[PDB]
Amino acid sequence: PVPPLSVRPAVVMQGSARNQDDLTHKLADIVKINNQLRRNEQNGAAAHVIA
Amino acid sequence: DAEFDEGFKVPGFLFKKLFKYQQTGVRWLWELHCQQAGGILGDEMGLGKTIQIIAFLAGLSYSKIRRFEGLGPTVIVCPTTVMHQWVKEFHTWWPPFRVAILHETGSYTHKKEKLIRDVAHCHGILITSYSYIRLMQDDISRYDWHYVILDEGHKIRNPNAAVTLACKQFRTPHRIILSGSPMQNNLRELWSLFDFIFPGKLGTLPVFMEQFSVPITMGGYSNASPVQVKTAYKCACVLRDTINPYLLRRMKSDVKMSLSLPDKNEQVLFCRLTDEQHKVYQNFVDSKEVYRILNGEMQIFSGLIALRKICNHPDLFSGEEDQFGYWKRSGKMIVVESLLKIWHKQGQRVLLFSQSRQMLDILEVFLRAQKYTYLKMDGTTTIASRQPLITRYNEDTSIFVFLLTTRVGGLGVNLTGANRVVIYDPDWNPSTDTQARERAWRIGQKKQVTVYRLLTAGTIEEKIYHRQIFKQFLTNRVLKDPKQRRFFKSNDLYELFTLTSPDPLASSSLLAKMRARNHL
DNA sequence: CTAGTTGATCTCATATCAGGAGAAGGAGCAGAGCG
DNA sequence: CGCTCTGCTCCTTCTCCCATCCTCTCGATGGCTATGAGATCAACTAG
Ligand SMILES: Nc1ncnc2c1ncn2[C@@H]1O[C@H](COP(=O)(O)OP(=O)(O)O)[C@@H](O)[C@H]1O
Numbered sequence: 082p083v084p085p086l087s088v089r090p091a092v093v094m095q096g097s098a099r100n101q102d103d104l105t106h107k108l109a110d111i112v113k114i115n116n117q118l119r120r121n122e123q124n125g126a127a128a129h130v131i132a
Numbered sequence: 133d134a135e136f137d138e139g140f141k142v143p144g145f146l147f148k149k150l151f152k153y154q155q156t157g158v159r160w161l162w163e164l165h166c167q168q169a170g171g172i173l174g175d176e177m178g179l180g181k182t183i184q185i186i187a188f189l190a191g192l193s194y195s196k197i198r199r200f201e202g203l204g205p206t207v208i209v210c211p212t213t214v215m216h217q218w219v220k221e222f223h224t225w226w227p228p229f230r231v232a233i234l235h236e237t238g239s240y241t242h243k244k245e246k247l248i249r250d251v252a253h254c255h256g257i258l259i260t261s262y263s264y265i266r267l268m269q270d271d272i273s274r275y276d277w278h279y280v281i282l283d284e285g286h287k288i289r290n291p292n293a294a295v296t297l298a299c300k301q302f303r304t305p306h307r308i309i310l311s312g313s314p315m316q317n318n319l320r321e322l323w324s325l326f327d328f329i330f331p332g333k334l335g336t337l338p339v340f341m342e343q344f345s346v347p348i349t350m351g352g353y354s355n356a357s358p359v360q361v362k363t364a365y366k367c368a369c370v371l372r373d374t375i376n377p378y379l380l381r382r383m384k385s386d387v388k389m390s391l392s393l394p395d396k397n398e399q400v401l402f403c404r405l406t407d408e409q410h411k412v413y414q415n416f417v418d419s420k421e422v423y424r425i426l427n428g429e430m431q432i433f434s435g436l437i438a439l440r441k442i443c444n445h446p447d448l449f450s451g452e453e454d455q456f457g458y459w460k461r462s463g464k465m466i467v468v469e470s471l472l473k474i475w476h477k478q479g480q481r482v483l484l485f486s487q488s489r490q491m492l493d494i495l496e497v498f499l500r501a502q503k504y505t506y507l508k509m510d511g512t513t514t515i516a517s518r519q520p521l522i523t524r525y526n527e528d529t530s531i532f533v534f535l536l537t538t539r540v541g542g543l544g545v546n547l548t549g550a551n552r553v554v555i556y557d558p559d560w561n562p563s564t565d566t567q568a569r570e571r572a573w574r575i576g577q578k579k580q581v582t583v584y585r586l587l588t589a590g591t592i593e594e595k596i597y598h599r600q601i602f603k604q605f606l607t608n609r610v611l612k613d614p615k616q617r618r619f620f621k622s623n624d625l626y627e628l629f630t631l632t633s634p635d636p637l638a639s640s641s642l643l644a645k646m647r648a649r650n651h652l
Numbered sequence: 653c654t655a656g657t658t659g660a661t662c663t664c665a666t667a668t669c670a671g672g673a674g675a676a677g678g679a680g681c682a683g684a685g686c687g
Numbered sequence: 688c689g690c691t692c693t694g695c696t697c698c699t700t701c702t703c704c705c706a707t708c709c710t711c712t713c714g715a716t717g718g719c720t721a722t723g724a725g726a727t728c729a730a731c732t733a734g
Pocket residue numbers: 149150151154175176177178179180181182183312544545546574575576
């Protein structure tokens with residue numbers, strides 16, 4: 082379960098740079114590796130790579 | 133009439149019109165029908181695959197073979213520029229067919245779902261586009277079509293594109309692909325095509341990749357050790373054997389003598405960057421953005437596109453007679469201007485290709501700066517006018533140059549009225565340019581053709597040329613012979629941001645084949 | 653009605669040290685029945 | 688008479704917790720993740 086935006090608000094700094102929450106960065110890592118694992122299982126990858 | 137093995141007759145007049153290899157192809161299509169398999173008409177561009185398909189379908193309707201009595205409702209999926217080319221060829225070759233178009237242009241003027249329904253219930257040929265197959269799979273697959281010919285079927289080459297998943301939803305066994313280049317970047321594309329015509333032959337993409345793609349590829353890198361070369365040769369032989377029954381790929385060298393085609397040249401000009409073009413390129417390779425690319429911080433695509441623009445023309449920094457896209461600022465346009473001058477005085481018609489729409493606009497402004505009469509067809513020109521445009525160019529010779537993007541101006545269109553063709557800018561994909569150059573040297577070309585490929589020497593373009601030579605060698609390893617010379621001209625690494633301006637078998641044939649294969 | 657142009661939208665394709673305290677598991681083992 | 692089934696102890700992890708409220712300054716944070724061709728389509732902008 083990925084929480085809503087209220088639990089991880091993207092606070093705007095003095096300028097326009099929108100800083101993301103720690104939860105959002107972590108979910109970014111999770112989605113990155115999840116997509117990476119999904120393609121590695123779908124396409125050519127070694128068993129140790131998938132592991 | 134000509135009669136084949138079981139009950140398949142093709143009319144004598146329709147058959148007499150064909151060539152020897154085209155009737156070999158009609159035969160091959162019908163053995164595919166008999167075995168209820170699909171296949172790839174891989175005859176390279178211009179040999180006539182529309183005619184083999186139409187002749188086979190006509191003989192399928194005319195033979196009244198036995199669910200469907202004769203020919204059922206078939207769908208032909210093709211690039212948008214050739215839907216009306218297909219309709220024209222059907223109406224001249226086999227007029228009894230009802231050939232609808234499923235497109236905005238179309239001819240229907242009612243709900244499209246109604247058109248699909250009617251063609252399913254009167255056994256017509258529904259000619260649609262890949263976009264429509266993606267968009268209307270809800271309706272296109274509720275009707276049990278009899279054939280699913282995909283023209284330029286290499287649009288199915290990505291196993292994960294939505295078009296690919298859509299086209300693989302037809303329940304029918306009689307899947308056909310027309311593509312004179314059914315392998316463009318790697319073997320995954322071949323797997324996708326064969327997974328459409330016959331899902332199981334090549335295995336799941338897991339097995340295909342591990343068994344074929346990694347071996348066959350790793351034996352083409354320059355540094356490949358001999359053992360790994362021999363493994364690649366063995367695996368290529370196995371793959372060719374496996375796909376032999378379902379690929380029919382004739383070239384214009386086994387047919388050309390039997391086809392009365394004129395001579396062909398394929399020169400590659402190495403243009404020179406101008407001093408200002410060189411200065412922009414040097415200041416971009418020295419720019420910090422390239423440094424960020426080489427460190428993995430930023431995406432390579434941005435820098436690649438910037439360099440391609442620089443070699444095309446310095447439209448990055450737009451420098452009277454200094455308007456945007458002035459021809460004298462780019463070396464390739466200097467070469468093109470000289471070539472157009474000579475060819476115009478030689479009374480000849482040219483086919484000018486470009487990967488980029490912006491560069492095509494620059495070349496249009498350049499041609500109008502000259503007095504040359506031209507004609508332009510990119511992805512923005514309305515589809516309904518594209519076949520008229522082609523017809524215009526082919527019919528009246530006052531029009532001198534035909535400005536084309538390789539993506540719409542390549543890919544199945546017949547432009548034999550053209551005589552000279554210059555590929556202004558290379559593409560990463562070799563086959564884009566193969567098909568663009570084959571737009572001229574086709575059945576119907578009565579004059580000698582020469583193709584000019586413009587590369588800026590020592591620039592990104594030469595590297596793209598090396599990439600596509602490597603890809604073409606990997607393709608030739610598994611289409612024409614498994615004994616391909618290793619690509620040694622480079623290691624094809626991420627230093628393409630550097631400017632380097634120049635200056636019953638009886639168990640013994642079987643066992644012998646096994647000892648052969650294993651000894652390798 | 654008829655084309656044609658123009659945005660928007662979406663698909664696709666290009667590359668390589670000055671804690672503590674308790675609770676839980678595990679292991680060594682002494683020993684009791686007892687098969 | 689050799690195996691099992693305890694169940695006691697010593698050690699080892701292992702994990703949790705460590706007053707309340709309040710004021711101020713100071714340094715870092717950047718995160719940036721493209722591009723374009725083609726097709727589709729729906730709305731004007733003319734006819
Ligand atoms: N046997 C033939 N007789 C007459 N014309 C032919 C024959 N075969 C092909 N053609 C013509 O050659 C042209 C090119 O063939 P086409 O089917 O467009 O090539 P591809 O195989 O690349 O699709 C077509 O316009 C077609 O009319």
